[PDB]
Design a protein around this ligand. Sequence first.
Ligand code: HEC
Ligand code: HEM
Ligand code: HEM
Ligand code: HEM
Ligand code: HEM
Lengths: 55, 68, 376, 376, 157, 48, 48, 70, 122, 243, 52, 59
Amino acid sequence: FSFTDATVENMRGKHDMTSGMVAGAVTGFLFGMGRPMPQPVAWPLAFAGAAVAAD
Amino acid sequence: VEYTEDDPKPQIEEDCKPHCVKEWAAYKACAERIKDDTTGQAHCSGQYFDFWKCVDHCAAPKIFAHLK
Amino acid sequence: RMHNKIQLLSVLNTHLVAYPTPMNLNYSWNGGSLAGMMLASQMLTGILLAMHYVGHVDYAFASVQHLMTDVPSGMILRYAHANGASLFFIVVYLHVLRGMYYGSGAQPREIVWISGVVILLVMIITAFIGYVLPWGQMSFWGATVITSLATAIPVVGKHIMYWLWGGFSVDNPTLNRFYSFHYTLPFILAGLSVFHIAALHQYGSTNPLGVNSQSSLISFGSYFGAKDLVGALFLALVFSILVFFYPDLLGHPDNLIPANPYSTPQHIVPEWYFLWVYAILRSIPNKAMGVLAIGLVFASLFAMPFIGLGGGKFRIITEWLYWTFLADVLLLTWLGGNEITPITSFVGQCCTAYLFFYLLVCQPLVGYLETQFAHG
Amino acid sequence: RMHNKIQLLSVLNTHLVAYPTPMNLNYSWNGGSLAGMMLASQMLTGILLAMHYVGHVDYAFASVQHLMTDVPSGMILRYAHANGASLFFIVVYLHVLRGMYYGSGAQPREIVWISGVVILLVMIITAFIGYVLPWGQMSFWGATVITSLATAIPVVGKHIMYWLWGGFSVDNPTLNRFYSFHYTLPFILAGLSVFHIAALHQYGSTNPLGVNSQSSLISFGSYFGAKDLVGALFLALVFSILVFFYPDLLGHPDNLIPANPYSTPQHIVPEWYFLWVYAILRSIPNKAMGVLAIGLVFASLFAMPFIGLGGGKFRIITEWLYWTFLADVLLLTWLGGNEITPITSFVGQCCTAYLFFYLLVCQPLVGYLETQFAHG
Amino acid sequence: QTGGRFLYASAARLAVLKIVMSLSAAADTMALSSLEVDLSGVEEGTTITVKWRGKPVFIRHRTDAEIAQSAEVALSELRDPQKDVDRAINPKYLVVVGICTHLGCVPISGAGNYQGWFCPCHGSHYDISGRIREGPAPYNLEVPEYRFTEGQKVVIG
Amino acid sequence: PIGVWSVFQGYVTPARLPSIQTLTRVGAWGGVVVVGGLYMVQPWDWLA
Amino acid sequence: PIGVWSVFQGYVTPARLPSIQTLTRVGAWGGVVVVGGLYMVQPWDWLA
Amino acid sequence: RQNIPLREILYQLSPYQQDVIRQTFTNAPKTFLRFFKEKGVGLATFGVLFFGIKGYTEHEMHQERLAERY
Amino acid sequence: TSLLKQVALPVFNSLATTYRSVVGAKLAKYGLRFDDLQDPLKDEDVAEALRRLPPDVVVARNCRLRRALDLSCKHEALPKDLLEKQTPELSYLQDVLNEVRAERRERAQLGAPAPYTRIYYD
Amino acid sequence: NEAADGLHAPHYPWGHEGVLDSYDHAAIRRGHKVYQQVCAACHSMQYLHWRQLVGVCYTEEEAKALAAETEVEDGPNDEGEMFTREGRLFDAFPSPYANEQAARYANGGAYPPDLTLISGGRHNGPNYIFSLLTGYRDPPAGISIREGLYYNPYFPGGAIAMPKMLVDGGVEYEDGTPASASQQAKDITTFLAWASYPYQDEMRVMGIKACLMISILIGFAAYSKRLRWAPIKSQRIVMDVVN
Amino acid sequence: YQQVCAACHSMQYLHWRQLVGVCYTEEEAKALAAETEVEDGPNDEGEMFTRE
Amino acid sequence: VMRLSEALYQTFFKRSTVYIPMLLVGAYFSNEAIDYAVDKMWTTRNKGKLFSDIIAERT
Ligand code: HEC
Ligand code: HEM
Ligand code: HEM
Ligand code: HEM
Ligand code: HEM
């Protein structure tokens, strides 16, 4: 999460919630890989929504 | 932005110098401590390099903002 | 039936089309075809570059520049050659590490491993004398430093050094003879590769399971041609990126300065693929002992099929020690590019000692203990 | 057996030690081993030569002179490499004439004959572009006259010519690419020689009697090693005489003049082994027809196993006609070194007509008549 | 057969010796192994570089203070103990070979902590008198054979 | 005895010769090499 | 395997090792290599 | 060519009677996790040894540079 | 020394049982046994021990190797009902191979060789 | 040693750094004008010709007029003598000195190096060049500089023989760009970066096409690999072995 | 050669060292070559000069 | 499921001598499309920096 978030922050040259969205989606995907299939969409949504709420 | 016939780089470098006061203090401490040298080998090039590396890293993107 | 009437059709059919191959080979078994393709690429681009290079100390650098700017497609050929050497060494090093991981040199494939070590030595010499041809600062000074290791041999050291140089220093006769030897040694590499491949076809390949595979064999041409094409395209992607986007990434900036025998660079370093041997040499504060240590490394590589016990996944202690060996050789690669320093000298000495310990102590003894654990 | 446990020793034993050979082979079956020895000698001398030769205009002549007078044993190496091409062509020509006399290309040895003709073409190209390398008057003007003969193909003429030259005239790019092509082509010669020998071993050699010799076969490695050594010693005697006593006898004095593109010599003739093709070309008063006749000679050489009937003795009419063919070819070799004269033009036209008549009319039809006489 | 092998062995030895000797030094290379160096165009405090046998020679005109500074260094501070008089027939004109015995690197004149030659390959310093003081180099700098003539001309090699 | 010996002995009859369809299918390879050469060189609108 | 597996399996015995006479006659080839090198280089003052 | 005694029934389907790459998207996360589960210990011990020894060496080199200062 | 090994032998046995547990867990997914991990090409004694076997044992060994190689190609493991039945330590070769190696050790003390060589192809 | 290594140069946001980005060809033109008026008094650039500036930096007629203002030695004539002539497109850039020794003699013993490949011939090329040209700072304590040498912490060793050469307004650009020292340094650094890699734009366009083509071909080859291996990956083996 | 066509003909690829032991001793060839003037340089100022 | 048409099979796929010229014309048009897309993207991104932009600006 932290690595990807700071990566997007440096890549976009500015600060917003989109970097947190990317970090949350990536974290959910990594967490969600290899499980039954209502999950690989839901978990990235949960993490991204959590990041958005945190911001 | 307006481009000036005068050189903007010394002014930008002077602007970044408060951001590196710690390295300047270390360099001045070195320069005071080798004041009474007689062998001719004591120098403070490393702390000088630390200070100017900090200033250069600050001022590098702000120098090309003022140049075409 | 038609290949039964001509010998050349029969040999090609037997060894390329209908050759039985284990059905469970993974993508770690693509290093050989990629190494052969990189040798063919090096030979083609080198033959094309030789039509514009001049092997004289007054015209070598200038002809390199003229080939870069004025010859049509000359920059593509020159960058393709210089970076195809690095990709050749990447593919060959990964091939050797595959063999070390699976213990592929064991019986009845001792000849394959020995011809491989011979191929690798010829490859190292070929690349080293090819790097001298641009006649830059690194090209001159690395040839000076490395060929000065002959004076570590007593009595007849300087005589062999002057015989190899053609004079009292590295100069024009050295460059001319290096050009002839460099043109010549790739054809010996092609012959050695043909012999090396024909040695493997006597018994076949090993499989990732490490068991006998004679019950499950499929034709090479129909199945592993496409599987080799996939890996060739992945290699072509990396080749395209290195040629067109980062052409001097794996090079040195000092080789773009013309050679000066009266002013050495501050940091004489080789190409990256000779850095582990250079770290082994620099870690020992004795030239004769360093040359002996390099020779003992290559002797231990030759003696692997007769002292090595322990193979793939099911032999787990040596499988775990393999990754320690891999970390050790990459640490040797990194240490070669750094300057001489007490901590780098100590760490290089420890890393060389661990490489010798893994090659000569872990592979026989731990292999014997795990054979006794599994089948005693 | 020790050779039954290593696959390298098994192949070497099978094809060089225990290979069954007819016991009644005379000394005209030593052409092939002599040709292989000459190929190896040329490769060795040239690889040694390339360490002192610079493939650039304004350095090539001076580098050859520095090789001749300053390199230790350099004069021996140059004269050996120059006269070795002549001896190589002498041996290969006598080999081809042996095969023409005995009908050696017939069934089942057609692949042997075809691979031989391919080897001969590569030998011709190699010798020509190697003759360009010293950069004298004969080198420059022969390369000019031969490469500016692609203006006989309609439309696509001077395009191919200028692409060969790398410019608008024979210059530094032509010499620089000729060096690379000349270095490279002898390895193709060595590979084609290995394939050629391997094609013969499928069925073994013919005998002077021209009958089946499967009942009387002896080992190669004991009986035909010393027999080849005797002929090799004769060839070494002739070679030593040519190198040390008459080093410039077979050459041309004009090639000791540095090349001048604005002044041409009075007589432009190639080396002696190219003279028969030159006479065929120079006799016909049309460039495209001369190139067509030169191509037709080699096409009729390729078609010889499928049209040629008749062998050595016991086929006496074709045996007698062989000597007229030999006289015709030697006459064409003599005519190529003369000037263009109406009588020499007429005689060269008659000789070319008889060469085609023998290759395309005598060998099928007279051979069929001989078979109808003997077994009809 | 022994009589024949007597000649076969000698022929093989002669052929191999002919092939091996062609890589040895040519006549013009051997002729360019002696060079004359003028000392009239050298001023005190400067280093001239002359290519002798393809090699940089750091002939340096030394002052009296520089001569005293080189002489005052004792043997206990040297990895290879040797005095300045033993390494130089003339203390004013020091003829030295500028190739380090470590790997074959060429130091730079007028540099180093000892005001001598700074070899930049391994950070190895040399004094003004060509003796090793710091670095991985075990030996000292080579002093080539040379002599003084009556016209201030030095024969090297 | 492959070549002119086959036709001297009478082994090349009207039978054992290729048919018209076989020669047309082989003869259809003439357009492929022409199109391949025109693809490789690309002399566009070069036909007079 | 044949190198160290044979030592570890107990297949290398004194009765299977080569004899001391065999080791003497095999090791006599060392003088041949010395005299061959002296013949090749001829680096002597031995002729006097 | 090396007779092998064996008793089996083998079935094979035509490659034009099944799909080619559609299952590759389903199995891709599972294969990723399986690869890292199988090679996790070796990659981790490689990374720990290489980066730890490199970091210790670089740290002590920086301390060596600092010790030369005045 | 004597009881040195006396005590050093239970530690060897514990390490051997742990090793066989881990490797047999790895082997059982492929349906293999510990004796299937021995190659007649890699060892001439194993090649000698394999021709001393009854034909059904050799047929079973070939079947197990074929199943494991098919599983390795498919990147699969055995299903749970087959995986629970796997017996990775049921020996079929160790007695015959031990006899072969004892015979070879016996012949070597009298200077005799083994009455077989490596498998040589072509 | 730190002083022997010199001060490292910061990473400046050059507009040509990315693989999708071209050169700024207006900056190459202004960089060549800094070369002609300040650099070329003591630097050679011996591997450049006026023909290579056409289509990159100038038109044909502008480059011809630039080359015609130079004196080029030519010969020999029919009397065996050396004469001078107007430069042409095929001529190389003029060298300020005939040889290395007079170049050393004019500059206190130091030889000003050739600038055709100085950008690719230094570590961190363009950044080091810009920081060296704009970086003539005051020396630190205990560092003394001999006569004929000037302090620059970016030069390794800290004592360079090249003095400060870029001054404000010392070049009169023809596009109206005001010429401070930093603008001149940036433009000449751009020109030198072009000189080291003259075909960077063409190489990047070819690399984009090659990467796209190979990436599509990887998918097509994976498709043809999986099609051939499908009867094997889905085969059914039934045997009597249970174990 | 030295008194007739040395004024109009060249002998490049020929050096004075190639006459020692053929028609002159070492000192005679040294004294003969010391009577010629050849272009050498450049010196420290970058100028060509002449030497024996 | 998805399946190549029979009438389209009998025309462009059954003979190699018809398949190969179709392959060459498809290769030509594919190269043209890839060239167009790459050149358009490069010229759009680097607008105002090329030499032709300066030349067309000076008209
Ligand atoms: C007064 C004559 C002179 C002028 C004019 C001049 N140079 Fe320098 N330049 C030198 C000398 C002398 C050196 C080498 C100094 C040394 O190596 O100690 C040098 C070195 C350099 C170097 C390489 C430094 C290194 O680390 O190797 C570069 C790059 C360079 N110059 C670029 C330029 C540029 C850009 C200009 C125009 C602004 C310029 N030069 C003008 C005299 C000059
Ligand atoms: C027949 C085969 C080959 C020929 C004719 C050939 C020829 C050449 C030539 C003429 C050069 C100098 C031109 C230049 O520097 O760009 C060169 C450079 C080089 N070659 Fe090859 N080569 C061949 C094969 C190989 C092989 C097999 C290798 C294996 C590693 C290799 C490695 C190199 C290297 C490292 C350089 C230096 C490149 C550089 O840094 O510029 N070459 N080669
Ligand atoms: C130019 C260099 C080389 C070429 C062209 C080459 C080619 C090949 C090929 C095609 C194979 C068969 C499939 C494969 O395993 O990829 C192979 C196998 C093998 N190679 Fe290489 N090789 C080269 C270098 C080496 C080297 C340097 C070594 C070892 C030091 C080596 C050792 C082996 C071994 C042991 C095998 C058998 C492995 C197995 O089948 O399990 N080879 N080689
Ligand atoms: C470098 C060139 C060549 C080499 C090394 C070579 C080598 C050999 C050798 C070693 C043999 C077996 C011994 C012998 O009969 O002499 C042979 C036989 C033969 N060669 Fe050559 N050859 C060469 C060129 C040619 C050429 C140019 C031709 C024909 C145009 C040719 C046609 C044949 C034929 C027909 C035989 C079989 C003769 C018989 O068994 O009656 N060869 N070759
Ligand atoms: C790897 C193999 C070879 C190499 C490296 C080689 C190399 C050379 C070189 C460097 C030269 C120019 C120097 C000189 O002319 O003295 C030369 C000239 C020549 N080469 Fe070779 N060569 C090879 C094989 C051959 C072969 C196989 C032939 C003939 C079939 C041949 C025929 C010639 C001839 C006729 C010349 C002209 C010699 C003269 O008149 O001075 N070369 N070669």
